[model samples]
Target: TPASRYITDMTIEELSRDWFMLMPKQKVEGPLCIRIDQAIMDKNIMLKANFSVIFDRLETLILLRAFTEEGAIVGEISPLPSFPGHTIEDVKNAIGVLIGGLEWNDNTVRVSKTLQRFAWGS
Candidate 1:
């Protein structure tokens, strides 16, 4: 089945709560991955640049997933933008920008991780 939508309709606090809900009580192993899909519009250069700055500031790795060609400003957008090595705080920081108007879709954010054990938790 496909995942549900409108996940990004909640406030930042609610989003943080959701993130905590998925976290393990004790320290877990592996890299915690944070992803957001269709988060920005293709023609929104400002948002794109802002995201680039945010990603660089956070020192996270970016993966160019896809582009949208349906909108009026059809061209290219980071349809499946994601970054690794981020803490919940980092995710929150990035989300702040997304909610601030950079985001183009609803319920497109996702947080997950690998199953490897590590000394620290994120």
Candidate 2:
């Protein structure tokens, strides 16, 4: 018999990177993780925290004031400070490009482009 093992405690960034590496290139197009990375580089956004931050096409995992659907907020944010004028809502809207539970009225963002490839497939 063969034994199986798993990574029980990988950091969010590490896990996100690993997952990104394994995904097909087409699938990775316009991913949230990459979007955030670009946003940071382009000065459209920033995260000044010391703890880990991870994101993918589906969601984001940031080691800030954590939230849960389980109905409780716990733990402590890392001692690092946040950039001026940025809020949790800002992070949520940025990452929500992937998770997609809300709609935006921002004209600069074109939701149609997010899944443009599927337009051809359809």
Each prediction's RMSD over C-alphas, in Å, is: 16.7, 17.1
How much lDDT does each candidate structure score? 0.26, 0.23
Clashes of 1: 6
Q: What's the lDDT of the predicted structure labeled candidate 2?
A: 0.23
| Residue 59 displacement in candidate 1 (angstroms) | 13
Best by lDDT: 1
TM-scores, all candidates, are 0.20, 0.22
lDDT of 1 by residue, 1-122 (tens): 11121112223442222212222222112233223333244333211111122222323322211112321111111222335444434434433443333244432322212100110124
Residue 71 in model 2: shift from native, Å? 26
List of clashing residue pairs for candidate 2: none
Give per-residue CA lDDT, model 2, range 23-70, as digits (tens). 221112121122211111111111211222223121122332211223
